[PDB]
UniProtKB/Swiss-Prot annotation:
Interacts with PKN2. Interacts with TIAM1 and TIAM2. Interacts with HA, as well as other glycosaminoglycans, collagen, laminin, and fibronectin via its N-terminal segment. Interacts with UNC119. Interacts with PDPN (via extracellular domain); this interaction is required for PDPN-mediated directional migration and regulation of lamellipodia extension/stabilization during cell spreading and migration. Interacts with RDX, EZR and MSN (via FERM domain). Interacts with EGFR. Interacts with CD74; this complex is essential for the MIF-induced signaling cascade that results in B cell survival. This is CD44 antigen. The lineage of its organism: Eukaryota, Metazoa, Chordata, Craniata, Vertebrata. The chain holds residues 23 to 171 of 778 of the full protein. Glycans are attached at N6, N38, N81, N92, N102. Residues 13-102 form the Link domain. It comes from Mus musculus (Mouse).
Length: 150
């Protein structure tokens, strides 16, 4: 009973979380997951500021209200070569990665590793935070509050 959460650098408090190496998070799970990081789904304004500080990914993820990809450099296989906060318009499907916003993080680029999941609750799952540099932090718990997400 294990969940892997791959996380990024934070940029103005905003970071990306990918669960189990594939698009697998619902919007309700996303809010709960960010809550376990003492975080919230970013607003579009928070995401735009993070973009300006150096944040980009090549993965769709929830923010408040939309599913997006922040892009700095045009790349043909990431958001159809767009730059800026690219907003997903048309999709059949409902599961993506998530973004999260932690207000207590540094104001600009923070590429230190994540070494805690401070607000998870008691539960039976081995949850492992996986950093881009491969360093890991694991703890037994749960974060999902909606049964349909479990
Ligand atoms: C508040 S902090 O910068 O030390 N750590 C954050 C908490 C969630 C993302 C990383």
């Amino acid at each position: 009973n294990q969940i892997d959460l791959n996380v990024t650098c934070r940029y103005a408090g905003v970071f990306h979380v990918e669960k189990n190496g594939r698009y697998s998070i619902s919007r309700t799970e996303a809010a709960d997951l960010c809550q376990a990081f003492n975080s919230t789904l970013p607003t579009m304004d928070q995401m735009k500021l993070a973009l300006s500080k150096g944040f980009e990914t090549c993965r769709y993820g929830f923010i408040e209200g939309n599913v997006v990809i922040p892009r700095i450099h045009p790349n043909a296989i990431c958001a159809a070569n767009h730059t800026g906060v690219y907003i997903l318009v048309t999709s059949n499907t409902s599961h993506y990665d998530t973004y999260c916003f932690n207000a207590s993080a540094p104001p600009e680029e923070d590429c230190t590793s994540v070494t805690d999941l401070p607000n998870s609750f008691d539960g039976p799952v081995t949850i492992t935070i996986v950093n881009r540099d491969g360093t890991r932090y694991s703890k037994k718990g749960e974060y999902r509050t909606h049964q349909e997400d479990i």
